[PDB]
Design a protein around this ligand. Structure first.
Ligand SMILES: [Zn+2]
Lengths: 205, 180
RNA sequence: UUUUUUUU
RNA sequence: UAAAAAAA
């Protein structure tokens, strides 16, 4: 595993999405250190240049989580075959986001967002980035009560449920919780060129 | 309890520094890890009024209340390498406490480029304390551990990644050639 | 934080 | 007046 997964690895990602009928595509390249839990990614919009908040796309970028040596790294062992994951995000105002993704690095993403209110914080871009959220893990399932910061105060809550399935059966770990922090490092006025940074570290429950 | 800007203002130190000229001070970051009941303590010490952060942290460990029973693997990520005299004070304080094991990781090899501070830190890496300059993890460790990684971000998300890599690439080979 | 050398 | 690199 460590001989093929070097301490510095790059990836390429292709996403096709459709939000409220508006179709678009996104091409990206990134780089990071999988064993240290840091990664950066640069994205470019190729079609539809976006009428919605970019923050709903950031939580979709997981193979770069730092795992202790005595904890089996379930996601790293899935390579070179890769894995898949499917995510459903239900926002408190009726917005729904369904995402499917295959990772082989080459990432292929298919995204469908529907039922977002025209006056909601997503379509009106009243968000200020995601708060820190501890996702407890126990295929692999993950449920998040995510909170989106608002410009005028308060939070914009959403229920996220994601299933990660490796293409090759490996040893499953015990109970643990991953602390994750994502940051938008740079973006233009219309969010057509975005760079993202991610830190992730697992801990015992 | 540090600022994200202050992190790169004091830890990031290139061969040719930034646009303001020598606006740099010395910091220390002690991470005491009592493994008995897994009860860690952390702290930063600025280079205070004519008392180097090494002596300040020594007196802090002194007047905080030690427990002579168990051993402590204390890591210490400091911006500027300790000088000659405080290194000898450190090794004399470590010789009196056999239940202490210290690791020293510096960001820049700070010294007056004379002879005394050369062997002043060569005794550490050969007798009690493995002293090497920082790399990627110890910066990444000290980044979110000591410097507050809270809600705001003072436009330094990953700018260190290239500067940390330059500092590693240069000063780690420098410190290795010094230890050799 | 003070010196020496090469190149654009 | 900028900046890349190396030696003690
Ligand atoms: Zn000193």
């Amino acid at each position: 595993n460590m001989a093929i997964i070097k301490e510095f690895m790059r990836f390429k990602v292709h996403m096709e999405g459709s939000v409220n009928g508006h179709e678009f595509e996104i091409e990206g390249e990134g780089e990071g250190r999988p064993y240290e839990g840091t990664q950066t990614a640069k994205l470019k919009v190729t079609k539809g240049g976006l009428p919605f908040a970019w923050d709903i796309l950031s939580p979709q970028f997981k193979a770069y989580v730092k795992h202790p040596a005595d904890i089996p790294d379930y996601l790293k062992l899935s390579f070179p075959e890769g894995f898949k994951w499917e995510r459903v995000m239900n926002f408190e105002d009726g917005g729904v986001v369904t995402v499917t993704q295959d990772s082989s690095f080459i990432y292929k993403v298919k995204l469908r967002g529907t039922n977002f209110p025209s006056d909601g914080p997503v379509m009106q871009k009243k968000t200020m980035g995601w708060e820190a959220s501890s996702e407890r893990m126990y295929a692999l399932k993950g449920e998040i009560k995510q909170r989106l910061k608002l410009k005028d105060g308060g939070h914009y809550d959403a229920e996220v449920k994601t299933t990660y399935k490796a293409k090759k059966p490996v040893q499953l770990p015990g109970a643990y919780n991953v602390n994750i922090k994502l940051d938008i490092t740079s973006h233009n006025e219309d969010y057509t060129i975005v760079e993202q940074y991610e830190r992730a570290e697992g801990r015992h429950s | 309890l540090l600022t994200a800007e202050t992190f790169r203002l004091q830890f990031n130190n290139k061969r040719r520094l930034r646009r303001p000229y020598y606006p740099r001070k010395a910091l220390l970051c002690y991470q005491l890890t009592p493994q008995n009941g897994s009860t860690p303590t952390r702290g930063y010490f600025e280079n205070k009024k004519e008392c180097h952060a090494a002596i300040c942290f020594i007196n802090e460990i002194k007047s905080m209340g030690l427990d002579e029973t168990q051993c402590y693997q204390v890591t210490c990520y400091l911006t500027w390498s300790p000088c000659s005299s405080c290194a000898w004070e450190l090794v004399d304080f470590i010789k009196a406490h056999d239940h202490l094991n210290l690791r020293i990781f510096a960001s820049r090899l700070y010294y007056h480029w004379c002879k005394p501070q050369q062997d002043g830190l060569r005794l550490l890496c050969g007798s009690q304390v493995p002293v090497e300059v920082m790399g990627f993890p110890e910066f990444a460790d000290c980044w979110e551990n000591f410097v507050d990684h809270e809600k705001p971000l003072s436009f330094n998300p990953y700018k260190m990644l290239e500067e940390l890599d330059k500092n590693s690439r240069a000063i780690k080979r420098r410190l290795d050639r010094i230890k050799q």
